[PDB]
């Protein structure tokens, strides 16, 4: 009756952009990025992959409300390091690990029976 | 009513397992636990899904209209 | 329009100024037939 | 290869029991989530009921029709109905299959999933065919007809994500367990007398070395070894479930990366 459509969990609305980059006003050289139509599946992974980068001071994601499929990711890096590059490096690292995992699983599957 | 097509909890297909369950019960004269075990229902949620079910459609088919 | 009986399989087409009862039956319980304009269902 | 490792312990048509090595917890969890909800699948989305003199209600039948496992092998070369430039649905996005059953014999006439007949043009793509892992070869029991009861309807199946409805769920239960000895101490065991005798011992204990009481707690250890068992429903093979899970996660990361590439526009 008042329940929202299901596709509003992954389909972007009217004018809604996928990422919203905002200059964090708290601490210098920090940023808060709004991910639309995404959940913990992406947030937790990216945040955990940002903490691997030792040039990243702060990195934390949160879902302000379970009703809506969106989450905010705050990133703070050292001076001389634009956080977008940290996000990009994190993402590419994720993609590489996943690709390697796919190749490995395939090669391991090609050796099985039944 | 009729046997639920898939298990609520996980999502395993248990709609094709009803008649086979009945056969394992009356034809092979097994108990419910072993019958459920043979049908590949290891988790107790699906095991529940079949064991707990009551086929009411057989009583519904008793009407002529 | 057309109507079908309750306790027997028939297919009466008696419109207004007719009503009850049925054709070769004896009971007055009459149900109405399903619409020709089909309705869709979201299998969810 | 060079990164994360896989060790297939058991392998069959329905299940894959393997060990994930050299991976972060969040990646294993995310992989599990994607495998559960974010993998594309073909299932009945629309039902057009012509005649229905069965016991079950219309949408009652439509519902369990929706849950029927359909072939989703070449689902990737099928398209979302919301993307296709057609009116409502076509052959490039949807698979239409009819159902015509009628009570014949005096005995109860069963209506299975095998009675579904593909009508729309598949044009080569392996898709739409209802999965039958049944021994007799019948499949999912859809309905039951009496002597003169008829069920005639038409199903339109569309590509969907399990995040939108659990009917598009390619997998069922995914087993997931790390550190069978609680050496990371992520769990404080509840007990009445003894902590070890009360709590059952996991199978996956066979693949790791027990802790020595002479050894202190390892506070600098993380989670590397994971024990997973992925079970498919039939719509998509297990190996393809985990692989397309991986590729889906990868693709939706690449979409964020691409978005970052796009936000540099004036
Ligand atoms: Zn279950
Ligand atoms: Zn009559
Ligand atoms: Zn189309």
């Amino acid at each position: 009756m008042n329940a929202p459509d299901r596709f509003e969990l992954f389909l972007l609305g009217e004018g809604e952009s996928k990422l919203k980059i905002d200059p964090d006003t708290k601490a210098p050289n920090a940023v808060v990025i709004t991910f639309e139509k995404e959940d913990h599946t992406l947030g937790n992974l990216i945040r955990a992959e940002l903490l691997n980068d030792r040039k990243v001071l702060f990195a934390a994601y949160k879902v302000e409300h379970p009703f809506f499929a969106r989450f905010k990711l705050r990133i703070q890096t050292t001076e001389g390091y634009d956080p977008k590059d940290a996000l990009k490096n994190a993402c590419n690292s994720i993609i590489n690990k996943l690709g390697a995992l796919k190749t490995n699983f395939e090669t391991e599957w090609n050796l099985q029976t039944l | 009513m009729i046997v639920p097509v898939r298990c609520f909890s996980c999502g395993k297909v248990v709609g094709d397992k009803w008649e086979s369950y009945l056969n394992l019960l009356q034809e092979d004269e097994l108990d419910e636990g072993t019958a459920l075990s043979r049908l590949g229902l290891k988790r107790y949620c699906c095991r529940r899904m079949i064991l707990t079910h009551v086929d009411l459609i057989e009583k519904f088919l008793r009407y002529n209209p | 329009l057309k109507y079908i009986c309750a306790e027997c399989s028939s297919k009466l087409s008696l419109s207004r100024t007719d009503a009850v009862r049925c054709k070769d039956c004896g009971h007055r319980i009459l149900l109405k037939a399903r619409t020709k304009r089909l309705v869709q269902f979201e299998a969810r | 290869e060079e990164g994360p490792q896989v060790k297939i312990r058991e392998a069959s048509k329905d299940n894959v029991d393997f060990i994930l090595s050299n991976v972060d917890l969040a990646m294993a969890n995310s992989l599990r989530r994607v495998m559960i909800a974010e993998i594309p699948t073909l299932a009945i989305d629309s039902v057009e009921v012509e005649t229905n003199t069965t016991v079950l209600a219309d949408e009652f039948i439509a519902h369990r029709l929706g849950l029927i496992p359909l072939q989703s092998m070449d689902i990737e070369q099928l398209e979302y109905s919301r993307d296709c430039f057609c009116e409502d649905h076509c052959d490039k996005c949807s698979v239409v299959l009819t159902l015509q059953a009628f009570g014949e014999s005096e005995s109860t006439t069963n209506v299975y999933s095998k009675d579904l007949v593909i009508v729309s043009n598949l044009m080569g793509r392996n898709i739409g065919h209802p999965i039958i892992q049944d021994k007799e070869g019948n499949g999912v029991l859809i309905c039951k007809l009496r002597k003169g009861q008829e069920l005639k309807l038409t199903c339109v199946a569309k590509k969907g994500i399990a995040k939108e409805h659990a009917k598009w769920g390619p997998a069922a239960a995914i087993e997931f367990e790390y550190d069978p000895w609680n050496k990371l101490k992520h769990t404080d065991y509840w007990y009445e007398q003894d902590s070890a005798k009360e709590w059952p011992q996991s199978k996956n204990c066979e693949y790791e070395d027990p802790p020595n009481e002479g050894d202190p707690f390892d506070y600098k250890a993380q989670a590397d070894t994971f024990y997973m068992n992925v079970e498919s429903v039939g719509s998509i093979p297990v190996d393809q479930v985990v692989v397309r899970g991986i590729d889906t996660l990868q693709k939706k990361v690449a979409s964020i990366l691409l978005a970052l590439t796009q936000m540099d526009q004036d």
Side-chain angles (χ1 to χ4, degrees), chain B residues 1-6 10-13 15-16 18-20 23 42-43 55 57-58 60-64, chain D residues 55-56 60 64 67 69 108 110 112 134 136 139-142 144 146 149 167 169 172-173 175 231 233:
Chain B
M1 299 284 292
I2 200 182
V3 40
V5 39
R6 294 166 79 162
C10 58
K12 193 184 187 307
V13 274
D16 47 11
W18 176 253
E19 300 176 338
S20 300
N23 282 331
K42 46 178 182 179
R43 298 178 299 273
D55 218 38
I57 192 176
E58 297 292 337
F60 293 147
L61 294 173
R62 297 299 308 277
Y63 301 102
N64 291 273
Chain D
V55 162
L56 311 181
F60 188 97
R64 40 178 38 245
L67 276 304
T108 300
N110 287 334
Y112 301 100
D134 189 83
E136 292 82 359
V140 177
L141 173 63
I142 281 312
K144 294 182 180 176
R146 207 188 186 267
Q149 294 181 354
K167 66 185 183 179
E175 305 177 12
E231 175 179 342
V233 195

Side-chain angles (χ1 to χ4, degrees), chain C residues 34-35 38-44, chain D residues 44-45 47 50 58 62 164-165 167:
Chain C
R34 184 186 181 92
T35 170
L38 298 199
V39 279
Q40 295 183 356
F41 289 90
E42 206 167 4
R44 303 189 184 186
Chain D
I44 308 299
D45 183 35
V47 174
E50 184 182 6
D58 289 322
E164 183 171 13
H165 200 278
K167 66 185 183 179

Side-chain angles (χ1 to χ4, degrees), chain D:
Chain D
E1 185 69 18
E2 53 85 59
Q5 299 296 327
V6 176
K7 192 176 300 178
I8 310 289
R9 294 198 273 104
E10 294 294 338
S12 60
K13 303 176 300 180
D14 299 35
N15 297 267
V16 274
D17 195 348
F18 65 97
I19 310 178
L20 248 171
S21 307
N22 192 19
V23 264
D24 192 272
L25 172 70
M27 187 168 299
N29 179 45
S30 299
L31 173 61
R32 170 188 143 270
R33 299 175 121 274
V34 171
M35 286 190 299
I36 284 187
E38 256 151 346
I39 296 182
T41 306
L42 179 72
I44 308 299
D45 183 35
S46 178
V47 174
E48 309 168 1
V49 175
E50 184 182 6
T51 59
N52 181 30
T53 54
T54 203
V55 162
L56 311 181
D58 289 322
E59 68 271 31
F60 188 97
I61 298 182
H63 173 242
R64 40 178 38 245
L65 282 178
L67 276 304
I68 295 183
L70 306 180
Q71 184 57 253
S72 297
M73 181 69 66
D74 302 338
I75 233 302
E76 292 184 352
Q77 53 180 157
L78 190 57
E79 200 171 12
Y80 287 103
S81 302
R82 57 173 181 265
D83 291 334
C84 189
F85 298 92
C86 69
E87 180 183 359
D88 197 342
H89 60 70
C90 68
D91 290 321
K92 297 184 60 179
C93 66
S94 68
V95 182
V96 175
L97 44 151
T98 183
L99 179 65
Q100 322 181 45
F102 176 56
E104 201 68 22
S105 59
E106 293 288 342
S107 61
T108 300
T109 307
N110 287 334
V111 184
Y112 301 100
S113 60
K114 73 171 181 179
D115 299 85
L116 287 174
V117 181
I118 310 295
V119 176
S120 64
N121 194 264
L122 302 182
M123 52 188 183
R125 297 167 308 191
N126 180 26
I127 211 80
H129 302 293
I131 271 70
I132 307 184
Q133 299 163 356
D134 189 83
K135 180 253 272 67
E136 292 82 359
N138 297 329
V140 177
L141 173 63
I142 281 312
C143 189
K144 294 182 180 176
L145 305 180
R146 207 188 186 267
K147 179 59 177 61
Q149 294 181 354
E150 185 185 7
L151 178 63
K152 180 111 70 65
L153 50 82
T154 308
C155 294
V156 177
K158 301 178 177 181
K159 169 198 285 289
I161 312 98
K163 194 177 184 181
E164 183 171 13
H165 200 278
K167 66 185 183 179
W168 285 300
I174 289 85
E175 305 177 12
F176 176 92
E177 176 177 6
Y178 67 93
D179 184 31
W181 293 104
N182 199 29
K183 296 180 290 185
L184 280 63
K185 294 190 179 303
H186 289 187
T187 290
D188 203 329
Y189 279 153
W190 183 99
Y191 61 93
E192 320 175 36
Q193 296 171 13
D194 187 22
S195 178
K197 192 179 300 179
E198 295 177 16
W199 283 97
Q201 194 172 20
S202 175
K203 180 183 297 182
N204 301 326
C205 289
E206 297 180 3
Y207 306 93
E208 287 192 19
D209 299 326
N212 297 19
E213 63 281 351
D215 298 338
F217 171 67
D218 187 12
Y219 48 84
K220 211 58 180 178
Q222 305 286 359
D224 288 27
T225 304
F226 300 87
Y227 299 89
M228 288 197 192
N229 177 87
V230 176
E231 175 179 342
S232 174
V233 195
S235 56
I236 297 181
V238 271
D239 60 325
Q240 288 303 317
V241 164
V242 302
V243 158
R244 291 179 190 185
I246 297 163
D247 281 324
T248 297
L249 183 54
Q250 167 187 344
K251 211 111 297 179
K252 76 150 50 193
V253 172
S255 64
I256 266 59
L257 199 61
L258 174 60
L260 288 179
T261 304
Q262 292 173 358
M263 278 203 58
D264 294 24
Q265 180 59 221
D266 306 334

Side-chain angles (χ1 to χ4, degrees), chain B residues 7-12 43 45-46 48-49:
Chain B
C7 163
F8 300 152
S9 309
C10 58
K12 193 184 187 307
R43 298 178 299 273
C45 51
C46 327
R48 152 189 67 102
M49 204 60 55

